[PDB]
RNA sequence: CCGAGGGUAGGGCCCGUGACUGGGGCGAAGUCGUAACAAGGUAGCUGUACCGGAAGGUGCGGCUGGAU
RNA sequence: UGGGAGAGGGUGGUGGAAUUCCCGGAGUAGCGGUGAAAUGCGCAGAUACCGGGAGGAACGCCGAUGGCGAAGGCAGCCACCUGGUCCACCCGUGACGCUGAGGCGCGAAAGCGUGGGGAGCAAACCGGAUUAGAUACCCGGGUAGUCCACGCCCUAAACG
RNA sequence: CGAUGUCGGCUCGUCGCAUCCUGGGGCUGAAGAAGGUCCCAAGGGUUGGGCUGUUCGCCCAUUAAAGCGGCACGCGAGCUG
RNA sequence: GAAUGCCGGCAUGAGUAACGAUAAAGAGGGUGAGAAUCCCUCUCGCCGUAAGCCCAAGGGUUCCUACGCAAUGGUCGUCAGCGUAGGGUUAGGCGGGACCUAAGGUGAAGCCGAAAGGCGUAGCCGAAGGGCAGCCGGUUAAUAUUCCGGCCCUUCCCGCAGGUGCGAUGGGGGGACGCUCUAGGCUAGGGGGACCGGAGCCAUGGACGAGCCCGGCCAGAAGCGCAGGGUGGGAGGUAGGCAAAUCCGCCUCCCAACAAGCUCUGCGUGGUGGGGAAGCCCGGGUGACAACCCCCCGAAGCCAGGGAGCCAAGAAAAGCCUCUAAGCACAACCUGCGGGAACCCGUACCGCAAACCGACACAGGUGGGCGGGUGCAAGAGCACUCAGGCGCGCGGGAGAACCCUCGCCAAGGAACUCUGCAAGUUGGCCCCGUAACUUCGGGAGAAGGGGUGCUCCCUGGGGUGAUGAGCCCCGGGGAGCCGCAGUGAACAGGCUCUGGCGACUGUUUACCAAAAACACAGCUCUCUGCGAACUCGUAAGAGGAGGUAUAGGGAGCGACGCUUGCCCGGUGCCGGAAGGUCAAGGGGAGGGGUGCAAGCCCCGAACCGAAGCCCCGGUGAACGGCGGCCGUAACUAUAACGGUCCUAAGGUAGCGAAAUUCCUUGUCGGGUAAGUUCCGACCUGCACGAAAAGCGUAACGACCGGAGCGCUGUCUCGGCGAGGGACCCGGUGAAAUUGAACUGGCCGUGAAGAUGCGGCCUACCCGUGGCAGGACGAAAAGACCCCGUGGAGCUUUACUGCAGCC
RNA sequence: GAGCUAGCCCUGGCCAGGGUGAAGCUGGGGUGAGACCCAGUGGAGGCCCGAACCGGUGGGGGAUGCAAACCCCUCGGAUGA
């Protein structure tokens, strides 16, 4: 339920913020935080390798459990749902009957005080994680490992999900968030439910200052530069592209496909994304 | 206005100092050159 | 003190007028097509929507004040 | 109080037929379409046939000159929530009634905003025909829209 | 071209006369008044404004008149820009 | 003898410009060979959120004293940051190290690279962050939380005593954190006192006073008091915290819970130890047995790890506490007391500046803390002042032009000019009041107006206190007084109407452009299924991201509103298991060289054989493109209509003489006395037009047009006045430039613009203040232009390669 | 060579005072319940005025400068990109 503001400054006309209703705990678990080393987009050479990055709010990283086959059978209680600045989704603090405590991505409709568990035998309820072979066809799912024991890789952003379409040999078939149809091995774990905080995509940043808070520095159109800088640079006055629209590095940026041809994962991609 | 020389003893020694010169092929050639030329100071003076 | 009025500044209502512009009414014998009245030769009408020199055409839903 | 009939409304589920697309198989020279044709599709293997899959929308028969709602309108099936209505009994209140300027709510389609969805259909638009022309009628394509959620619009041959 | 700063304006003048005005004339299709045309004449004079960077020109209000040209399109070691 | 040659020397300009903020000087007395310039005194002026005081960096003896004045000091010099000499910096508690970690750096393991080397978990290094024990006063010419005095404290070693399962680089807790707003109680600091202490003073008309002037505190251990912070206690279970664990975590139960209890800070008190003014006398002495008390204001600091709200969600590690493992339990550790031990480096001085960065004793630049009082609504603003510090290291006269900075101006009021450029006007607070339009916030300080000082009287609430007084903070009413004038000085918007552009706040060409440019939220296209795409790297490795399609990259467009048409023939990209072409390779019809031959060697047709290209389709918020001629209506004119040629298709909506219109000052209308600009229209649009977006849009703008009101020295049209210069005298003393010069006008001549040639004319010798016509004056080997088979940046369907990709 | 300058990473510091008065909250009204209205409270914002601080708009001065970018007046931002 994105919150609006009255237009009492030019920027507050359009600014919208998350409503934060689902959040029940305002400070993180001290045993689960560690410092997030900000990069400014620079690599170990000190060279910028991703432009226009840096200068956003300080963040502590929350260690997230992307395995969950880690503690098979051991049930846990949903203690709190918290804000996490390192990801679009909210995170849920789990108190295991073990005494162990862990964060997961908070699925949609998860409730503080309910119980989740993982394993081949777990119930098909929002918050539980089973190997994909034991989740029934049709089930909406998030936080999907892409290769057994390698960790949840798919459908982690706020509002996203995969859906199980079918099974074939050792593999199940998923519809990924992007609409792709892809074989994923049956032993890969996945959590029942879609990721929460689905209104995330309706936030209107409102002003330039907001992008700066997120560590996003201003992006400069190549058409605004010179030929030393960019294919679209130069020209007296404004100028159209005057060549196929290109990146700062010269490669084309309106349709040119870029996935590696002979990539082994191709044998498992049934249908490329659409729409 | 603000000029280009803003002296700083730490900066001076970590940038031009004897140890910085010795850690690097080019720096060692500098030391060797200035020794061949008979320079009285191989390396900038700085209080530390 | 109040005070006819005069002065300054800002509003409100009305009337006249204005390059140009919008449609409307009227006008014995102008140009273009033929939309409607017969199943009017694609039944018509209809609210809306898009399109077209023009009447109009098409979509969606509605009406019979339609015929055989 | 005791019963009844009903596509009355809202929510969640869910079933089969059909179209389209995809995959596999089998097969070959046409298919489609019309007044006639053409454009279009097809030896890069279409149409016609079998099996598998995906997805959306609408519910054949029953079905009616039928039923329900104040109107707009409402039709597969199941459950829950919920309104109006009739009948019987002749039990209770004792005129507590009628209408209703304003107000408030509802209000087909089309349309608008933000998301989502998109099989079929189809304004606009392209092409093929027709014609003197054909910004039409017919034919091949096809985008909004048609569908869902929330918020608007408030019109009608909203008619008996 | 081992640099002769290039429009216009401002300021400051000064000169030529093919004279705009003032002074003197001849002819007139010069009644008078007012003109036209040419001759002599450079002593002095030759306004303020609107528009445009403008020169120029048009317009407003005047005037005896609102002259035309030269001085490195006079004048940036004088100003402006 | 020339090279704008090189090095050096010395001239010219010239006793010329200048002597470095216009805060400002005068005198008396000393010293000395010499004094505007050094010292002393009095007078005057300037700073005082500093031009004062304290840290840090940087500097490196500049510090103090004695003796000096050649040079350095923009003059002088007896003086000095200068010369010579001597002296001066004292720490267990301040800062840093023997402690911790941040980015980052380095780097056992390991990885990669022709070599050099590049990476890299741990670990180590790395601080202005964490952690950690000293406050007040006195003393020196010069150091002081360092020496001394007083009162406090930390660690290490050894011992005694009591207590305890002791023990860790391992487990856990804690350390541990944002922004904005903020409560209670305090402290710093400040104001007043008719009270306390004080040398004194009565002036010039009055005052011997509840007079004036000066001062009225600082540190402090335990204890106590006040105000805060921090923390539930017991038991049972236990499979998690990479061994163990009584710790922590999770579960359950009981009690205690705005508490309490315990614990820790801050503040007050506190044994005691200090300090202690004006004035007078000579830094010292007195004052002085100094007094040291009361009221009020009160923090941005303290209690603090306090509270609340918000989204952008806010370091680490050690110290410390707890747990247990080896081990050891004669040890060890905890607590208390006692004795002993306690190292290294910094410490002078400058520090918004004459000692640092700017070649200079340079109007520039330089981070942190303190920064008093009064009035002005507030304040770190402004004026004046305290403490403290200064008068800016050339002066003295004069009272021209001209220049700078400043004040005033009759009548007019933008007539100035490219332009109201500049300068006026306005100007704070309180009250009244306020338009189109709007996205309902705004526009708004719209506009426009009234009030504003002082005195007396009555009166309201708040803080302090006691509920009162007093102090204190905002006021309310009435009656008066004076002046030209009451935010009486200083600080402090001119306003309006209407266009263009860009939504907005932001950003930029350091040092000629701040804008309409860039960015910007937002919109769209497109790539990307994760060992992602993409980027940097030879690689390893990184970034992307400890992210995962509501995400990440690339591109265009640029809030928002209403919209974004037609063309896919060419180029791009996307799709296409066919066909055509196609390299190495496969294949070997069939030849050739040599040898006696076996053979050895060479050429080689068909055919099979990738990507790419051809070919077939798709695709515009991909590159892009969106016609011509002729005819036609019952006045004329003009063509809804028609004919025909062509194209991949012929520009739709909207807008239009425009930031675009050549003809052009188009035409008409508005404004004006008059309008090449402006505004509104028209449309034959040289040459608008729909995400290089089209048309609009409230608000916003040191953007750029046009207009009006207000007001003016902008102007008619100039006048006067001020100071700093210019000028004269004393001191110090440059510069570019310069073939040499004994360097006039005209008319001519001359390489075509002559001081220098010819002919005339004019003209005694030399300076000073001024003006700029000439010396084709200076400056810079023209940056425009061309030339050079000169250079460089940039582009592409130029050529030819390379990385990269297939 | 990043002691200037540009960006980023780590860790600290700074922003007088005045003004405007968003949400929320409380209460009152309102209704079947509502939406909503009103008052108080509250203290938001690339909000407003303005020092420090960061700038460099216009003009004047300076131009062998005090200065190889300075000075005076004026002007922009000043809780934020
Ligand atoms: Mg909003
Ligand atoms: Mg609103
Ligand atoms: Mg939430
Ligand atoms: Mg930690
Ligand atoms: Mg590194
Ligand atoms: Mg990048
Ligand atoms: Mg970057
Ligand atoms: Mg993310
Ligand atoms: Mg989150
Ligand atoms: Mg798999
Ligand atoms: Mg979005
Ligand atoms: Mg952030
Ligand atoms: Mg962006
Ligand atoms: Mg950009
Ligand atoms: Mg450019
Ligand atoms: Mg550019
Ligand atoms: Mg470059
Ligand atoms: Mg290039
Ligand atoms: Mg290029
Ligand atoms: Mg270009
Ligand atoms: Mg350009
Ligand atoms: Mg152009
Ligand atoms: Mg450009
Ligand atoms: Mg082009
Ligand atoms: Mg290109
Ligand atoms: Mg895909
Ligand atoms: Mg600088
Ligand atoms: Mg520096
Ligand atoms: Mg240093
Ligand atoms: Mg340092
Ligand atoms: Mg340094
Ligand atoms: Mg280095
Ligand atoms: Mg070194
Ligand atoms: Mg070497
Ligand atoms: Mg040397
Ligand atoms: Mg030596
Ligand atoms: Mg060296
Ligand atoms: Mg009268
Ligand atoms: Mg019809
Ligand atoms: Mg008809
Ligand atoms: Mg009909
Ligand atoms: Mg017909
Ligand atoms: Mg049509
Ligand atoms: Mg109907
Ligand atoms: Mg075939
Ligand atoms: Mg065929
Ligand atoms: Mg589908
Ligand atoms: Mg009865
Ligand atoms: Mg409706
Ligand atoms: Mg509808
Ligand atoms: Mg025909
Ligand atoms: Mg009917
Ligand atoms: Mg020349
Ligand atoms: Mg020369
Ligand atoms: Mg020259
Ligand atoms: Mg003039
Ligand atoms: Mg006569
Ligand atoms: Mg006559
Ligand atoms: Mg004359
Ligand atoms: Mg003119
Ligand atoms: Mg001219
Ligand atoms: Mg002209
Ligand atoms: Mg002339
Ligand atoms: Mg001449
Ligand atoms: Mg000429
Ligand atoms: Mg000429
Ligand atoms: Mg000239
Ligand atoms: Mg000049
Ligand atoms: Mg000139
Ligand atoms: Mg000159
Ligand atoms: Mg000259
Ligand atoms: Mg110019
Ligand atoms: Mg010679
Ligand atoms: Mg020379
Ligand atoms: Mg030479
Ligand atoms: Mg020579
Ligand atoms: Mg030389
Ligand atoms: Mg010599
Ligand atoms: Mg010489
Ligand atoms: Mg000499
Ligand atoms: Mg000389
Ligand atoms: Mg001389
Ligand atoms: Mg002289
Ligand atoms: Mg001279
Ligand atoms: Mg000079
Ligand atoms: Mg000078
Ligand atoms: Mg000054
Ligand atoms: Mg004197
Ligand atoms: Mg002297
Ligand atoms: Mg002397
Ligand atoms: Mg002096
Ligand atoms: Mg003295
Ligand atoms: Mg005196
Ligand atoms: Mg003061
Ligand atoms: Mg030095
Ligand atoms: Mg001397
Ligand atoms: Mg001397
Ligand atoms: Mg001597
Ligand atoms: Mg000297
Ligand atoms: Mg001297
Ligand atoms: Mg000097
Ligand atoms: Mg002497
Ligand atoms: Mg000393
Ligand atoms: Mg000590
Ligand atoms: Mg030691
Ligand atoms: Mg360490
Ligand atoms: Mg280091
Ligand atoms: Mg430290
Ligand atoms: Mg210490
Ligand atoms: Mg102490
Ligand atoms: Mg001391
Ligand atoms: Mg123990
Ligand atoms: Mg914490
Ligand atoms: Mg933390
Ligand atoms: Mg910290
Ligand atoms: Mg925040
Ligand atoms: Mg105290
Ligand atoms: Mg006070
Ligand atoms: Mg007396
Ligand atoms: Mg007395
Ligand atoms: Mg256990
Ligand atoms: Mg004393
Ligand atoms: Mg005594
Ligand atoms: Mg502070
Ligand atoms: Mg603060
Ligand atoms: Mg604190
Ligand atoms: Mg707190
Ligand atoms: Mg760490
Ligand atoms: Mg033992
Ligand atoms: Mg113990
Ligand atoms: Mg040692
Ligand atoms: Mg030492
Ligand atoms: Mg010291
Ligand atoms: Mg300064
Ligand atoms: Mg300072
Ligand atoms: Mg000094
Ligand atoms: Mg330098
Ligand atoms: Mg000086
Ligand atoms: Mg200085
Ligand atoms: Mg005081
Ligand atoms: Mg004030
Ligand atoms: Mg002075
Ligand atoms: Mg000064
Ligand atoms: Mg001076
Ligand atoms: Mg004089
Ligand atoms: Mg001055
Ligand atoms: Mg005055
Ligand atoms: Mg006067
Ligand atoms: Mg006047
Ligand atoms: Mg006027
Ligand atoms: Mg006037
Ligand atoms: Mg004017
Ligand atoms: Mg101008
Ligand atoms: Mg003024
Ligand atoms: Mg004022
Ligand atoms: Mg108005
Ligand atoms: Mg209004
Ligand atoms: Mg207006
Ligand atoms: Mg408006
Ligand atoms: Mg309004
Ligand atoms: Mg006012
Ligand atoms: Mg007023
Ligand atoms: Mg009054
Ligand atoms: Mg008075
Ligand atoms: Mg009076
Ligand atoms: Mg103001
Ligand atoms: Mg702009
Ligand atoms: Mg702007
Ligand atoms: Mg715009
Ligand atoms: Mg806009
Ligand atoms: Mg701002
Ligand atoms: Mg610049
Ligand atoms: Mg430049
Ligand atoms: Mg420069
Ligand atoms: Mg400038
Ligand atoms: Mg510019
Ligand atoms: Mg600006
Ligand atoms: Mg820019
Ligand atoms: Mg913008
Ligand atoms: Mg947009
Ligand atoms: Mg989008
Ligand atoms: Mg690369
Ligand atoms: Mg290599
Ligand atoms: Mg990273
Ligand atoms: Mg990472
Ligand atoms: Mg932009
Ligand atoms: Mg743009
Ligand atoms: Mg914008
Ligand atoms: Mg609008
Ligand atoms: Mg095309
Ligand atoms: Mg095509
Ligand atoms: Mg194409
Ligand atoms: Mg091929
Ligand atoms: Mg083109
Ligand atoms: Mg084209
Ligand atoms: Mg259209
Ligand atoms: Mg036009
Ligand atoms: Mg236009
Ligand atoms: Mg044009
Ligand atoms: Mg024109
Ligand atoms: Mg023109
Ligand atoms: Mg005209
Ligand atoms: Mg007119
Ligand atoms: Mg026209
Ligand atoms: Mg374009
Ligand atoms: Mg353009
Ligand atoms: Mg426009
Ligand atoms: Mg606008
Ligand atoms: Mg506007
Ligand atoms: Mg602006
Ligand atoms: Mg601007
Ligand atoms: Mg103007
Ligand atoms: Mg005006
Ligand atoms: Mg005016
Ligand atoms: Mg004047
Ligand atoms: Mg004077
Ligand atoms: Mg004399
Ligand atoms: Mg002299
Ligand atoms: Mg001298
Ligand atoms: Mg000579
Ligand atoms: Mg001579
Ligand atoms: Mg001479
Ligand atoms: Mg002469
Ligand atoms: Mg000639
Ligand atoms: Mg001559
Ligand atoms: Mg001569
Ligand atoms: Mg001669
Ligand atoms: Mg001769
Ligand atoms: Mg001669
Ligand atoms: Mg001669
Ligand atoms: Mg003569
Ligand atoms: Mg002289
Ligand atoms: Mg002179
Ligand atoms: Mg001259
Ligand atoms: Mg001159
Ligand atoms: Mg000359
Ligand atoms: Mg010459
Ligand atoms: Mg000359
Ligand atoms: Mg020059
Ligand atoms: Mg040369
Ligand atoms: Mg040359
Ligand atoms: Mg040249
Ligand atoms: Mg040159
Ligand atoms: Mg140039
Ligand atoms: Mg040339
Ligand atoms: Mg050539
Ligand atoms: Mg040649
Ligand atoms: Mg060349
Ligand atoms: Mg080159
Ligand atoms: Mg290569
Ligand atoms: Mg690539
Ligand atoms: Mg730097
Ligand atoms: Mg430095
Ligand atoms: Mg601030
Ligand atoms: Mg106000
Ligand atoms: Mg309020
Ligand atoms: Mg609240
Ligand atoms: Mg602001
Ligand atoms: Mg204000
Ligand atoms: Mg000005
Ligand atoms: Mg200069
Ligand atoms: Mg300045
Ligand atoms: Mg100023
Ligand atoms: Mg401001
Ligand atoms: Mg502020």
**DSSP class of residue A62?**
E
Q: How many Å separate Cα A234 from the centre of its chain? A: 38
Name the residues in B1-48 having a C-beta closer than 7 Å to nucleic acid strand F: 1-10, 25, 46-47
Dihedral angle of Cα A20, A21, A25, A29, to the nearest 10 degrees: -50
Nearest 5°: phi and psi at B4? -85, -15
Q: How far is the CA of A9 from the C1' of F452 (A)?
A: 36
**Ligand 218 centre distance from Cα of residue A174 (Å):** 103
The three-state secondary structure class of A107 is: strand
Closest CA to A23 of A197, A202, A204: A197
Contact A130, A116 (CB under 8 A): no
Method: X-ray
Q: How many CB atoms lie within 10 A of CB A90?
A: 23
Give me the sign of the Cα torsion angle A47, A49, A50, A52.
Answer: positive
Dihedral angle of Cα A269, A88, A106, A69, to the nearest 10 degrees: 50
Name the residues in A224-253 having a C-beta closer than 7 Å to nucleic acid strand F: 224, 227-228, 230-232, 234, 237-249, 251-253
Q: How far is the CA of A11 from the C1' of F502 (A)?
A: 17
What is the rounded CA–CA span in Å between residue A219 and residue A54?
Answer: 12
Q: How many CB atoms lie within 10 A of CB A18?
A: 18
- Cα-Cα end-to-end distance for chain B: 28
Helices assigned H by DSSP within chain A? 208-213
The three-state secondary structure class of B4 is: coil
What is the rounded CA–CA span in Å between residue A208 and residue A227?
Answer: 27
What is the rounded CA–CA span in Å between residue A174 and residue A188?
Answer: 12
Non-local (6+) Cβ contacts of A139 within 8 A are A124, A163, A164, A192
- The pairing of beta strand A33-35 with beta strand A76-82: unpaired
Q: Strand G closer than 7 Å to the CB of B4?
A: yes
Structure tokens at A36: 């997030």
Q: How many CB atoms lie within 10 A of CB B47?
A: 6
Structure tokens at A103: 């964060």
What is the rounded CA–CA span in Å between residue A112 and residue A115?
Answer: 9
The three-state secondary structure class of A132 is: helix
Q: How many CB atoms lie within 10 A of CB A165?
A: 15
What is the rounded CA–CA span in Å between residue A198 and residue A83?
Answer: 14
Closest CA to A197 of A228, A146, A160, A153: A160
What is the rounded CA–CA span in Å between residue A22 and residue A160?
Answer: 17
The three-state secondary structure class of B30 is: helix
What is the rounded CA–CA span in Å between residue A135 and residue A139?
Answer: 7
In Å, what resolution does this model reach?
2.5
Contact A52, A217 (CB under 8 A): yes
What is the rounded CA–CA span in Å between residue A265 and residue B12?
Answer: 54
Contact A31, A60 (CB under 8 A): no
- Cα-Cα end-to-end distance for chain A: 27
């Amino acid at each position: 339920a994105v919150k609006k503001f009255k237009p009492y400054t030019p920027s507050r006309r359009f600014m919208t913020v998350a409503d934060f209703s689902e959040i029940t705990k305002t400070e993180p678990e001290k045993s689960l935080v560690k410092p997030l080393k900000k990069t400014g987009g620079r690599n170990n050479q000190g060279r910028i390798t991703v432009r226009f990055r840096g200068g956003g709010h300080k963040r502590l990283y929350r260690i997230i459990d992307f395995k969950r086959w880690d503690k098979v059978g051991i049930p846990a209680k949903v203690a709190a749902i918290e804000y996490d600045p390192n990801r679009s989704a909210r995170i849920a603090l789990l108190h295991y009957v073990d005494g162990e405590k862990r964060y997961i991505i908070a699925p949609d409709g998860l409730q503080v005080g309910q119980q989740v568990v993982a394993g081949p035998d777990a119930p098909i309820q929002v918050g539980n994680a089973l190997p994909l072979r034991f989740i029934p066809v049709g089930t909406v799912v998030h936080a999907v490992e892409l290769e057994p024991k390698k960790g949840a890789k798919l459908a982690r952003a706020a509002g996203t999900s995969a859906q199980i379409q079918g099974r074939e040999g050792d593999y199940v078939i998923l519809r990924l968030p992007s609409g792709e149809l892809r074989k994923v091995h049956g032993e890969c774990y996945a959590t029942v439910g879609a990721v929460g905080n689905a209104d995330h995509k309706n936030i209107v940043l409102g002003k330039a200052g907001r992008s700066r808070w997120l560590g996003r520095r201003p992006h400069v159109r190549g058409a605004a530069m010179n030929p030393v800088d960019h294919p679209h640079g130069g020209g007296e006055g404004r100028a159209p592209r005057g060549r196929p629209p290109a990146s700062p590095w010269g490669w084309q940026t309106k349709g040119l496909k870029t996935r590696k041809r002979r990539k082994p994962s191709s044998r498992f991609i049934i249908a490329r994304r659409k729409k | 206005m603000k000029r280009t020389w803003q002296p700083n003893r730490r900066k001076r020694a970590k940038t031009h100092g004897f140890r910085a010169r010795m850690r690097t092929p080019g720096g060692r050639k500098v030391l060797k050159r200035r020794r061949q030329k008979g320079r009285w100071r191989l390396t900038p003076a700085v209080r530390k």
